[PDB]
Amino acid sequence: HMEHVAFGSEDIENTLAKMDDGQLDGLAFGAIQLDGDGNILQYNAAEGDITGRDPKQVIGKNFFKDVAPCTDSPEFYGKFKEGVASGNLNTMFEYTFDYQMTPTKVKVHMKKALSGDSYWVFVKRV
Ligand SMILES: *C(=O)/C=C/c1ccc(O)c(Br)c1
DSSP: OOOOOOOOTHHHHHHHOOOOOHHHOOSHHHHEEEOTOOOOOEHHHHHHHHHOOOTTTTTTTHHHIIGGGGGGIIIIIOOOOOOOOHHEEEEEEEEEOOSSSOOOOEEEEEEEETTTEEEEEEEOOO
16 A cells, blocks of 8 residues: 655656656655645645645645745755756755644655656655
């Protein structure tokens, strides 16, 4: 009932290109797909369990402006938009999520998706 994909795997963008919503919900880690502006295209069940948000409700919201203002910073949004601009986004770092929630530290892996104007944000607890 799970997709046997590890967080941080070198070819994660190839493995996840085949997955619809149900398959994304089979991952062990949170998975968000953003467009280049930060609008949420996809959001899986594991991420909803980490953050408390409803994966169906967040689609179409802007990550940086709307749902995740704590990521509107050089250390998160800044890294994202630099990787969008280069066309080779691939950066991993720890971060704390603290907006209208118990502060929760995560490991974040942002990586360009194979789909046009699409960027993954992968998430697990630390
Ligand atoms: C800080 O504001 C973090 C907010 C947050 C992190 C992760 C997800 O998935 C959401 Br919808 C919000």
